Amino acid sequence: XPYSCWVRH
Amino acid sequence: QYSPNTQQGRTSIVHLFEWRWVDIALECERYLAPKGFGGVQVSPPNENVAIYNPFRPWWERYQPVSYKLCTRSGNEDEFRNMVTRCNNVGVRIYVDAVINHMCGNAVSAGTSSTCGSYFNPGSRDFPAVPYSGWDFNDGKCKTGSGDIENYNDATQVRDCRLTGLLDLALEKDYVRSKIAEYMNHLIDIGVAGFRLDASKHMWPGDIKAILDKLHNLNSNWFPAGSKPFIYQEVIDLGGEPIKSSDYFGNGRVTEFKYGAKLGTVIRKWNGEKMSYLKNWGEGWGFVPSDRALVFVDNHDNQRGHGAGGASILTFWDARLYKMAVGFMLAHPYGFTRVMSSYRWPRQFQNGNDVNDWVGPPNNNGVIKEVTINPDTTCGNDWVCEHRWRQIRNMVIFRNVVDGQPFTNWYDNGSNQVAFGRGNRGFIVFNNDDWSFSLTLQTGLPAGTYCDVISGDKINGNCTGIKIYVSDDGKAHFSISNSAEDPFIAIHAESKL
Ligand SMILES: [Ca+2]
Ligand SMILES: [Cl-]
Protein backbone atom coordinates (compact mmCIF):
# COMPACT_ATOMS: atom_id res chain seq x y z
CA UNK A 1 0.00 0.00 0.00
CA PRO A 2 0.84 3.50 0.91
CA TYR A 3 4.25 5.18 1.30
CA SER A 4 6.16 2.51 -0.64
CA CYS A 5 4.39 -0.13 1.47
CA TRP A 6 5.72 1.39 4.69
CA VAL A 7 3.71 -0.86 6.98
CA ARG A 8 5.76 -3.96 6.06
CA HIS A 9 8.73 -2.38 7.97
CA GLN B 1 -8.18 25.61 -7.72
CA TYR B 2 -7.16 24.43 -11.20
CA SER B 3 -4.61 27.12 -11.96
CA PRO B 4 -1.02 26.63 -10.73
CA ASN B 5 -0.64 30.38 -10.12
CA THR B 6 2.83 30.31 -11.61
CA GLN B 7 4.38 33.39 -13.17
CA GLN B 8 3.64 34.07 -16.84
CA GLY B 9 5.53 31.58 -18.99
CA ARG B 10 6.67 29.14 -16.29
CA THR B 11 5.07 25.75 -16.87
CA SER B 12 6.53 23.13 -14.48
CA ILE B 13 7.07 22.44 -10.80
CA VAL B 14 9.90 20.45 -9.24
CA HIS B 15 9.55 18.22 -6.16
CA LEU B 16 12.61 18.97 -4.01
CA PHE B 17 12.01 15.77 -2.02
CA GLU B 18 13.14 16.12 1.64
CA TRP B 19 15.20 19.25 0.98
CA ARG B 20 15.82 21.68 3.83
CA TRP B 21 14.09 25.06 3.64
CA VAL B 22 17.34 27.03 3.52
CA ASP B 23 18.54 24.96 0.56
CA ILE B 24 15.25 25.45 -1.29
CA ALA B 25 15.45 29.21 -0.66
CA LEU B 26 18.94 29.28 -2.16
CA GLU B 27 17.90 27.04 -5.07
CA CYS B 28 15.04 29.42 -5.93
CA GLU B 29 17.49 32.31 -6.26
CA ARG B 30 20.48 30.60 -7.86
CA TYR B 31 18.78 28.19 -10.27
CA LEU B 32 15.00 27.84 -10.35
CA ALA B 33 14.30 31.49 -11.17
CA PRO B 34 16.92 32.05 -13.94
CA LYS B 35 16.18 28.65 -15.56
CA GLY B 36 12.41 29.23 -15.77
CA PHE B 37 11.02 26.81 -13.18
CA GLY B 38 7.47 27.55 -12.01
CA GLY B 39 7.51 26.30 -8.45
CA VAL B 40 8.57 23.79 -5.82
CA GLN B 41 6.61 21.03 -4.14
CA VAL B 42 8.04 20.79 -0.60
CA SER B 43 7.92 17.86 1.81
CA PRO B 44 5.25 18.16 4.54
CA PRO B 45 6.24 21.12 6.73
CA ASN B 46 4.27 20.13 9.88
CA GLU B 47 5.67 18.27 12.89
CA ASN B 48 5.76 14.49 12.53
CA VAL B 49 6.74 11.37 14.49
CA ALA B 50 10.47 10.82 14.83
CA ILE B 51 10.79 7.12 13.96
CA TYR B 52 14.04 5.48 15.05
CA ASN B 53 13.48 1.90 13.89
CA PRO B 54 14.08 1.95 11.04
CA PHE B 55 16.30 5.01 11.43
CA ARG B 56 14.43 8.17 10.33
CA PRO B 57 12.60 6.86 7.24
CA TRP B 58 11.33 9.35 4.68
CA TRP B 59 7.73 8.31 5.38
CA GLU B 60 7.83 9.35 9.04
CA ARG B 61 6.86 12.75 7.56
CA TYR B 62 3.48 11.29 6.59
CA GLN B 63 2.65 10.64 10.28
CA PRO B 64 1.70 14.04 11.75
CA VAL B 65 1.95 14.87 15.45
CA SER B 66 0.92 18.54 15.18
CA TYR B 67 0.59 21.45 12.77
CA LYS B 68 3.61 23.33 14.09
CA LEU B 69 5.97 24.16 11.21
CA CYS B 70 8.87 22.30 12.73
CA THR B 71 10.57 19.40 10.90
CA ARG B 72 13.94 18.03 9.84
CA SER B 73 13.66 20.49 6.95
CA GLY B 74 13.62 23.47 9.34
CA ASN B 75 11.56 25.63 11.70
CA GLU B 76 8.86 28.23 11.03
CA ASP B 77 11.35 31.07 10.56
CA GLU B 78 13.27 29.11 7.93
CA PHE B 79 10.02 28.08 6.24
CA ARG B 80 8.73 31.67 6.10
CA ASN B 81 12.16 32.81 4.88
CA MET B 82 12.08 30.23 2.07
CA VAL B 83 8.56 31.10 0.89
CA THR B 84 9.33 34.85 0.87
CA ARG B 85 12.64 34.48 -0.99
CA CYS B 86 11.19 32.15 -3.61
CA ASN B 87 8.09 34.31 -4.19
CA ASN B 88 10.35 37.34 -4.53
CA VAL B 89 12.05 35.78 -7.57
CA GLY B 90 8.80 34.43 -9.03
CA VAL B 91 9.05 30.77 -7.98
CA ARG B 92 6.05 29.35 -6.11
CA ILE B 93 5.85 26.95 -3.17
CA TYR B 94 3.34 24.10 -3.06
CA VAL B 95 2.90 22.27 0.26
CA ASP B 96 2.39 18.54 0.75
CA ALA B 97 -0.65 18.63 3.06
CA VAL B 98 -1.07 15.52 5.21
CA ILE B 99 -4.64 15.91 6.44
CA ASN B 100 -6.26 12.47 6.20
CA HIS B 101 -4.64 11.21 9.39
CA MET B 102 -2.28 11.70 12.28
CA CYS B 103 0.31 9.07 13.16
CA GLY B 104 0.15 5.29 13.42
CA ASN B 105 -2.12 3.92 16.13
CA ALA B 106 0.68 1.66 17.44
CA VAL B 107 3.28 4.41 17.86
CA SER B 108 4.56 4.70 21.44
CA ALA B 109 3.39 7.78 23.33
CA GLY B 110 5.95 10.34 24.43
CA THR B 111 7.85 13.18 22.77
CA SER B 112 9.62 11.36 19.92
CA SER B 113 8.50 14.11 17.54
CA THR B 114 10.29 16.59 15.35
CA CYS B 115 9.45 19.55 17.64
CA GLY B 116 9.36 17.65 20.96
CA SER B 117 5.55 17.89 21.19
CA TYR B 118 3.88 15.28 23.38
CA PHE B 119 1.42 12.86 21.80
CA ASN B 120 -0.31 9.60 22.77
CA PRO B 121 -1.76 7.58 19.87
CA GLY B 122 -3.30 4.86 22.04
CA SER B 123 -5.39 7.46 23.88
CA ARG B 124 -5.78 9.59 20.70
CA ASP B 125 -4.32 12.64 22.46
CA PHE B 126 -2.52 15.17 20.25
CA PRO B 127 -2.60 18.16 22.62
CA ALA B 128 -0.38 20.30 20.41
CA VAL B 129 -3.21 20.73 17.91
CA PRO B 130 -5.32 19.86 20.07
CA TYR B 131 -7.05 16.65 18.95
CA SER B 132 -8.77 14.16 21.24
CA GLY B 133 -10.47 10.81 20.72
CA TRP B 134 -13.63 12.70 19.68
CA ASP B 135 -11.70 13.86 16.58
CA PHE B 136 -11.07 10.43 15.00
CA ASN B 137 -13.17 7.89 13.10
CA ASP B 138 -12.91 4.98 15.58
CA GLY B 139 -16.69 4.93 16.08
CA LYS B 140 -17.41 5.50 12.37
CA CYS B 141 -15.35 2.65 10.90
CA LYS B 142 -17.15 -0.69 10.51
CA THR B 143 -14.29 -3.15 9.98
CA GLY B 144 -13.35 -5.67 12.64
CA SER B 145 -9.72 -4.52 12.77
CA GLY B 146 -10.48 -0.81 12.47
CA ASP B 147 -8.17 -0.72 9.43
CA ILE B 148 -8.96 -0.64 5.72
CA GLU B 149 -9.57 -4.23 4.63
CA ASN B 150 -11.46 -4.16 1.31
CA TYR B 151 -10.87 -1.59 -1.45
CA ASN B 152 -14.09 -2.60 -3.21
CA ASP B 153 -15.89 -0.85 -0.30
CA ALA B 154 -15.62 2.88 -0.90
CA THR B 155 -16.95 3.68 2.58
CA GLN B 156 -14.29 1.92 4.66
CA VAL B 157 -11.53 3.27 2.39
CA ARG B 158 -12.66 6.66 3.72
CA ASP B 159 -13.67 6.01 7.33
CA CYS B 160 -11.19 3.33 8.45
CA ARG B 161 -7.50 3.53 9.30
CA LEU B 162 -5.10 3.48 6.36
CA THR B 163 -2.49 0.89 7.49
CA GLY B 164 -3.34 1.77 11.05
CA LEU B 165 -2.86 5.54 10.67
CA LEU B 166 -5.32 7.34 12.98
CA ASP B 167 -8.11 8.55 10.70
CA LEU B 168 -9.34 12.08 11.34
CA ALA B 169 -13.10 12.70 11.53
CA LEU B 170 -13.17 15.10 8.59
CA GLU B 171 -16.94 15.57 8.81
CA LYS B 172 -16.58 17.49 12.09
CA ASP B 173 -16.44 21.26 11.78
CA TYR B 174 -13.84 21.44 14.57
CA VAL B 175 -11.45 19.13 12.72
CA ARG B 176 -12.06 20.92 9.41
CA SER B 177 -11.33 24.19 11.19
CA LYS B 178 -8.06 22.97 12.71
CA ILE B 179 -6.93 21.79 9.28
CA ALA B 180 -8.02 25.02 7.61
CA GLU B 181 -6.21 27.02 10.29
CA TYR B 182 -3.05 25.10 9.40
CA MET B 183 -3.47 25.65 5.63
CA ASN B 184 -4.41 29.32 6.12
CA HIS B 185 -1.24 29.82 8.13
CA LEU B 186 0.62 28.49 5.10
CA ILE B 187 -1.42 30.50 2.60
CA ASP B 188 -0.72 33.76 4.43
CA ILE B 189 2.99 32.94 4.59
CA GLY B 190 2.64 32.84 0.81
CA VAL B 191 2.29 29.25 -0.46
CA ALA B 192 0.56 28.97 -3.84
CA GLY B 193 -1.20 25.64 -3.45
CA PHE B 194 -1.32 22.17 -1.97
CA ARG B 195 -0.75 18.55 -2.79
CA LEU B 196 -3.52 16.78 -0.86
CA ASP B 197 -1.92 13.56 0.37
CA ALA B 198 -4.00 10.37 0.46
CA SER B 199 -7.01 12.02 -1.15
CA LYS B 200 -8.58 8.66 -2.04
CA HIS B 201 -9.06 8.09 1.71
CA MET B 202 -11.05 11.32 2.15
CA TRP B 203 -14.60 12.06 1.02
CA PRO B 204 -14.67 14.58 -1.86
CA GLY B 205 -17.24 16.58 0.11
CA ASP B 206 -15.09 16.74 3.23
CA ILE B 207 -12.23 18.07 1.12
CA LYS B 208 -14.60 20.68 -0.31
CA ALA B 209 -15.68 21.71 3.21
CA ILE B 210 -12.05 22.26 4.23
CA LEU B 211 -11.21 24.18 1.06
CA ASP B 212 -14.31 26.37 1.57
CA LYS B 213 -12.58 27.72 4.69
CA LEU B 214 -9.35 28.81 3.00
CA HIS B 215 -8.21 32.40 2.45
CA ASN B 216 -7.37 33.72 -0.97
CA LEU B 217 -3.67 33.82 -1.82
CA ASN B 218 -1.41 36.43 -0.28
CA SER B 219 -2.18 39.67 -2.07
CA ASN B 220 1.45 40.86 -1.99
CA TRP B 221 2.34 38.26 -4.59
CA PHE B 222 -0.88 37.08 -6.24
CA PRO B 223 -3.74 38.96 -7.95
CA ALA B 224 -6.80 39.56 -5.80
CA GLY B 225 -9.21 36.64 -5.69
CA SER B 226 -6.51 34.08 -6.48
CA LYS B 227 -7.26 30.62 -5.09
CA PRO B 228 -4.77 27.96 -3.93
CA PHE B 229 -3.79 25.46 -6.61
CA ILE B 230 -5.14 22.07 -5.49
CA TYR B 231 -3.85 18.75 -6.77
CA GLN B 232 -5.19 15.65 -5.07
CA GLU B 233 -3.18 12.43 -4.83
CA VAL B 234 -5.56 9.72 -6.05
CA ILE B 235 -4.11 6.53 -7.54
CA ASP B 236 -6.78 5.49 -10.07
CA LEU B 237 -5.71 2.77 -12.52
CA GLY B 238 -9.31 1.64 -13.06
CA GLY B 239 -11.09 -1.35 -11.60
CA GLU B 240 -11.96 0.33 -8.28
CA PRO B 241 -15.21 1.99 -7.14
CA ILE B 242 -13.44 5.27 -6.40
CA LYS B 243 -12.66 7.28 -9.53
CA SER B 244 -10.34 10.26 -9.71
CA SER B 245 -13.11 12.16 -11.51
CA ASP B 246 -15.00 12.17 -8.18
CA TYR B 247 -12.45 14.81 -7.10
CA PHE B 248 -12.62 17.21 -10.09
CA GLY B 249 -14.80 19.63 -8.12
CA ASN B 250 -11.93 20.33 -5.72
CA GLY B 251 -8.98 20.75 -8.09
CA ARG B 252 -6.64 18.71 -10.24
CA VAL B 253 -5.67 15.09 -9.61
CA THR B 254 -2.43 13.14 -9.95
CA GLU B 255 -2.59 11.01 -13.11
CA PHE B 256 -0.70 7.86 -12.08
CA LYS B 257 -1.57 6.10 -15.34
CA TYR B 258 0.71 8.59 -17.09
CA GLY B 259 4.07 7.43 -15.79
CA ALA B 260 3.09 3.78 -15.60
CA LYS B 261 2.13 3.70 -19.27
CA LEU B 262 5.05 5.85 -20.40
CA GLY B 263 7.50 3.64 -18.54
CA THR B 264 6.18 0.46 -20.14
CA VAL B 265 6.24 2.13 -23.57
CA ILE B 266 9.79 3.46 -23.40
CA ARG B 267 11.02 0.21 -21.89
CA LYS B 268 9.29 -1.51 -24.86
CA TRP B 269 7.53 -3.91 -22.48
CA ASN B 270 4.20 -5.75 -22.95
CA GLY B 271 4.21 -5.22 -26.72
CA GLU B 272 4.26 -1.42 -26.43
CA LYS B 273 6.00 0.86 -28.96
CA MET B 274 6.67 4.61 -29.06
CA SER B 275 4.68 4.89 -32.31
CA TYR B 276 1.59 4.19 -30.16
CA LEU B 277 2.09 7.57 -28.44
CA LYS B 278 0.60 9.45 -31.43
CA ASN B 279 -2.70 9.74 -29.49
CA TRP B 280 -1.11 10.23 -26.03
CA GLY B 281 -3.38 11.86 -23.46
CA GLU B 282 -7.09 11.29 -22.96
CA GLY B 283 -6.88 8.96 -25.97
CA TRP B 284 -5.17 6.55 -23.57
CA GLY B 285 -8.00 6.92 -21.02
CA PHE B 286 -6.36 9.58 -18.86
CA VAL B 287 -8.30 12.34 -17.10
CA PRO B 288 -8.90 15.54 -19.12
CA SER B 289 -5.65 17.43 -19.63
CA ASP B 290 -6.87 20.44 -17.61
CA ARG B 291 -7.41 18.27 -14.53
CA ALA B 292 -4.12 16.32 -14.68
CA LEU B 293 -0.90 16.74 -12.75
CA VAL B 294 1.55 14.48 -14.61
CA PHE B 295 5.00 13.08 -13.82
CA VAL B 296 7.24 10.21 -14.87
CA ASP B 297 7.97 9.10 -11.29
CA ASN B 298 7.22 10.46 -7.86
CA HIS B 299 8.96 10.10 -4.51
CA ASP B 300 6.84 7.04 -3.71
CA ASN B 301 6.78 4.89 -6.86
CA GLN B 302 10.41 5.61 -7.76
CA ARG B 303 11.10 2.94 -5.10
CA GLY B 304 9.53 0.29 -7.35
CA HIS B 305 6.75 -0.87 -5.02
CA GLY B 306 4.12 1.61 -6.16
CA ALA B 307 1.67 2.30 -8.96
CA GLY B 308 3.48 0.75 -11.95
CA GLY B 309 5.99 -1.39 -10.03
CA ALA B 310 9.18 -2.01 -11.98
CA SER B 311 8.00 -0.18 -15.10
CA ILE B 312 8.38 3.26 -13.52
CA LEU B 313 11.47 4.99 -14.91
CA THR B 314 13.72 6.71 -12.38
CA PHE B 315 17.12 8.41 -12.18
CA TRP B 316 18.60 4.93 -11.71
CA ASP B 317 17.69 4.31 -15.41
CA ALA B 318 19.11 7.66 -16.45
CA ARG B 319 19.25 7.15 -20.24
CA LEU B 320 15.64 6.02 -20.67
CA TYR B 321 14.57 8.32 -17.85
CA LYS B 322 15.80 11.42 -19.69
CA MET B 323 13.87 10.29 -22.79
CA ALA B 324 10.63 9.82 -20.81
CA VAL B 325 10.95 13.20 -19.08
CA GLY B 326 11.72 14.78 -22.44
CA PHE B 327 8.62 13.33 -24.07
CA MET B 328 6.50 14.44 -21.10
CA LEU B 329 7.88 17.99 -21.11
CA ALA B 330 7.42 18.35 -24.88
CA HIS B 331 3.85 16.98 -25.01
CA PRO B 332 1.00 19.43 -24.25
CA TYR B 333 -0.96 17.04 -21.98
CA GLY B 334 -1.21 18.01 -18.33
CA PHE B 335 0.64 20.22 -15.88
CA THR B 336 4.11 18.75 -15.46
CA ARG B 337 6.01 17.95 -12.26
CA VAL B 338 9.68 16.95 -12.37
CA MET B 339 11.18 14.77 -9.63
CA SER B 340 14.40 15.67 -7.77
CA SER B 341 15.67 12.79 -5.65
CA TYR B 342 18.38 11.55 -3.30
CA ARG B 343 20.36 8.32 -3.57
CA TRP B 344 19.95 5.45 -1.12
CA PRO B 345 21.49 1.95 -0.97
CA ARG B 346 18.94 0.06 -3.05
CA GLN B 347 18.77 -3.66 -2.19
CA PHE B 348 16.20 -5.69 -4.08
CA GLN B 349 15.01 -9.01 -2.64
CA ASN B 350 12.16 -10.56 -4.66
CA GLY B 351 11.63 -7.47 -6.81
CA ASN B 352 11.12 -5.21 -3.78
CA ASP B 353 13.74 -2.93 -2.24
CA VAL B 354 14.28 -3.61 1.46
CA ASN B 355 15.89 -0.17 1.81
CA ASP B 356 13.02 1.75 0.23
CA TRP B 357 12.40 3.35 3.66
CA VAL B 358 15.79 5.07 3.88
CA GLY B 359 15.53 8.80 4.47
CA PRO B 360 17.45 11.73 3.02
CA PRO B 361 21.24 11.93 3.27
CA ASN B 362 21.97 12.56 6.92
CA ASN B 363 24.54 12.67 9.70
CA ASN B 364 22.92 10.91 12.66
CA GLY B 365 19.50 12.05 11.46
CA VAL B 366 20.45 15.66 10.64
CA ILE B 367 19.75 16.24 6.95
CA LYS B 368 22.85 17.12 4.91
CA GLU B 369 22.96 20.38 2.98
CA VAL B 370 22.67 20.39 -0.80
CA THR B 371 26.12 21.23 -2.15
CA ILE B 372 26.58 22.40 -5.73
CA ASN B 373 29.33 20.60 -7.63
CA PRO B 374 31.49 22.46 -10.15
CA ASP B 375 29.59 20.94 -13.11
CA THR B 376 26.37 22.34 -11.48
CA THR B 377 25.07 18.94 -10.35
CA CYS B 378 24.78 18.24 -6.60
CA GLY B 379 26.93 16.53 -4.00
CA ASN B 380 26.13 14.82 -0.70
CA ASP B 381 24.19 12.21 -2.71
CA TRP B 382 21.42 14.56 -3.79
CA VAL B 383 20.64 13.53 -7.37
CA CYS B 384 19.30 16.91 -8.57
CA GLU B 385 17.66 15.56 -11.74
CA HIS B 386 16.27 19.04 -12.31
CA ARG B 387 19.85 20.27 -12.87
CA TRP B 388 20.63 17.65 -15.52
CA ARG B 389 21.15 19.53 -18.79
CA GLN B 390 18.76 17.25 -20.69
CA ILE B 391 15.96 17.81 -18.16
CA ARG B 392 16.47 21.49 -17.33
CA ASN B 393 16.60 22.32 -21.03
CA MET B 394 13.30 20.53 -21.60
CA VAL B 395 11.75 22.47 -18.72
CA ILE B 396 12.74 25.53 -20.79
CA PHE B 397 11.48 23.97 -24.05
CA ARG B 398 8.07 23.54 -22.44
CA ASN B 399 8.07 27.22 -21.45
CA VAL B 400 9.02 28.34 -24.95
CA VAL B 401 6.31 26.31 -26.73
CA ASP B 402 3.56 26.93 -24.14
CA GLY B 403 0.18 27.20 -25.82
CA GLN B 404 1.28 25.77 -29.19
CA PRO B 405 -0.54 22.78 -30.72
CA PHE B 406 0.76 19.25 -31.01
CA THR B 407 1.56 18.91 -34.71
CA ASN B 408 3.85 17.42 -37.39
CA TRP B 409 3.82 13.93 -35.86
CA TYR B 410 6.08 11.32 -37.48
CA ASP B 411 6.63 7.67 -36.63
CA ASN B 412 8.31 4.68 -38.28
CA GLY B 413 5.68 2.21 -37.06
CA SER B 414 8.13 1.11 -34.37
CA ASN B 415 10.08 3.29 -31.90
CA GLN B 416 11.32 6.28 -33.95
CA VAL B 417 8.92 9.21 -33.48
CA ALA B 418 8.94 13.00 -33.72
CA PHE B 419 6.52 15.88 -33.32
CA GLY B 420 6.38 19.65 -33.13
CA ARG B 421 4.66 22.26 -31.00
CA GLY B 422 3.27 24.81 -33.42
CA ASN B 423 6.09 26.81 -34.97
CA ARG B 424 8.05 27.00 -31.68
CA GLY B 425 9.59 23.58 -31.01
CA PHE B 426 10.39 20.19 -32.49
CA ILE B 427 11.61 16.95 -30.85
CA VAL B 428 12.89 13.66 -32.31
CA PHE B 429 13.29 10.31 -30.51
CA ASN B 430 15.07 7.13 -31.55
CA ASN B 431 14.19 4.19 -29.30
CA ASP B 432 14.81 1.48 -31.94
CA ASP B 433 17.87 -0.76 -32.25
CA TRP B 434 19.10 0.91 -35.43
CA SER B 435 19.99 4.43 -36.45
CA PHE B 436 17.46 7.15 -37.24
CA SER B 437 18.59 9.19 -40.24
CA LEU B 438 15.77 11.09 -41.88
CA THR B 439 14.62 14.50 -43.05
CA LEU B 440 11.51 15.66 -41.18
CA GLN B 441 9.06 18.54 -41.38
CA THR B 442 9.74 20.55 -38.22
CA GLY B 443 7.23 23.41 -38.53
CA LEU B 444 10.03 25.80 -37.52
CA PRO B 445 11.28 28.91 -39.31
CA ALA B 446 14.44 28.46 -41.36
CA GLY B 447 17.82 28.73 -39.68
CA THR B 448 20.40 27.07 -37.46
CA TYR B 449 19.20 25.61 -34.14
CA CYS B 450 21.20 24.31 -31.18
CA ASP B 451 20.09 20.89 -30.04
CA VAL B 452 19.34 21.52 -26.35
CA ILE B 453 19.73 17.86 -25.38
CA SER B 454 23.38 17.45 -26.37
CA GLY B 455 24.33 21.02 -25.57
CA ASP B 456 23.29 24.61 -24.98
CA LYS B 457 22.97 27.89 -26.82
CA ILE B 458 25.49 30.34 -25.29
CA ASN B 459 25.85 33.80 -26.89
CA GLY B 460 25.43 32.92 -30.61
CA ASN B 461 27.18 29.56 -30.25
CA CYS B 462 26.06 25.97 -29.71
CA THR B 463 28.02 23.68 -27.42
CA GLY B 464 26.58 20.49 -28.94
CA ILE B 465 24.76 19.39 -32.09
CA LYS B 466 23.43 21.89 -34.65
CA ILE B 467 20.28 21.35 -36.71
CA TYR B 468 19.77 23.15 -40.03
CA VAL B 469 16.14 23.96 -40.88
CA SER B 470 15.64 24.90 -44.53
CA ASP B 471 13.08 27.33 -45.97
CA ASP B 472 10.50 24.54 -46.28
CA GLY B 473 10.76 23.81 -42.54
CA LYS B 474 12.53 20.49 -43.15
CA ALA B 475 15.66 19.35 -41.34
CA HIS B 476 17.83 16.25 -41.38
CA PHE B 477 18.26 14.40 -38.07
CA SER B 478 20.77 11.64 -37.38
CA ILE B 479 20.51 9.71 -34.10
CA SER B 480 22.47 6.52 -33.56
CA ASN B 481 20.81 3.95 -31.34
CA SER B 482 24.14 3.97 -29.50
CA ALA B 483 23.94 7.73 -28.81
CA GLU B 484 24.31 8.78 -25.18
CA ASP B 485 20.92 10.57 -25.34
CA PRO B 486 18.99 9.23 -28.35
CA PHE B 487 16.79 12.28 -28.82
CA ILE B 488 17.16 15.83 -30.14
CA ALA B 489 15.11 18.91 -29.25
CA ILE B 490 15.20 22.39 -30.84
CA HIS B 491 13.01 25.41 -30.25
CA ALA B 492 12.59 29.12 -30.99
CA GLU B 493 14.99 30.25 -28.27
CA SER B 494 17.74 27.80 -29.30
CA LYS B 495 17.93 29.31 -32.81
CA LEU B 496 21.20 31.07 -33.60
CA1 LIG C 1 -10.03 8.86 6.01
CL1 LIG D 1 2.04 12.52 -5.86
Side-chain angles (χ1 to χ4, degrees), chain B residues 41 195 231-233 254 256 293 295 298-300 337:
Chain B
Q41 176 183 310
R195 173 197 187 264
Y231 52 115
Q232 299 153 107
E233 183 214 20
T254 54
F256 279 88
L293 187 299
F295 46 97
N298 77 349
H299 69 284
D300 190 308
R337 180 181 65 195

Side-chain angles (χ1 to χ4, degrees), chain B residues 20-95:
Chain B
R20 302 149 78 233
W21 306 151
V22 300
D23 291 330
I24 295 180
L26 292 168
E27 192 71 349
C28 284
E29 293 167 340
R30 76 201 165 188
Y31 200 80
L32 301 182
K35 303 305 190 188
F37 281 83
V40 182
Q41 176 183 310
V42 301
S43 285
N46 61 293
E47 176 183 22
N48 61 266
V49 179
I51 296 177
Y52 287 94
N53 194 9
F55 185 75
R56 309 313 297 271
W58 66 264
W59 38 250
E60 74 170 36
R61 293 187 79 157
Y62 293 92
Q63 299 196 27
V65 162
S66 89
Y67 297 128
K68 302 171 180 175
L69 301 187
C70 180
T71 61
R72 288 204 288 173
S73 284
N75 58 30
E76 179 165 344
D77 289 338
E78 296 171 284
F79 185 84
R80 287 180 165 270
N81 179 261
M82 163 197 80
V83 177
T84 301
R85 285 162 68 182
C86 294
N87 272 332
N88 282 345
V89 293
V91 173
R92 306 306 183 202
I93 295 293
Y94 306 90
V95 159

Side-chain angles (χ1 to χ4, degrees), chain B residues 100 137 157-160 167-168 170 201-202:
Chain B
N100 174 73
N137 277 338
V157 174
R158 268 69 168 259
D159 299 336
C160 295
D167 202 64
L168 283 161
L170 296 182
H201 304 280
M202 302 186 278

Side-chain angles (χ1 to χ4, degrees), chain B residues 58-59 108 121 133 257 273 307 351 437 456 477:
Chain B
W58 66 264
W59 38 250
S108 304
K257 299 174 177 174
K273 323 164 176 165
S437 187
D456 295 276
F477 298 90

Side-chain angles (χ1 to χ4, degrees), chain B residues 327-339:
Chain B
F327 186 92
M328 171 185 73
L329 292 170
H331 194 278
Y333 180 87
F335 189 77
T336 45
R337 180 181 65 195
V338 163
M339 178 67 192

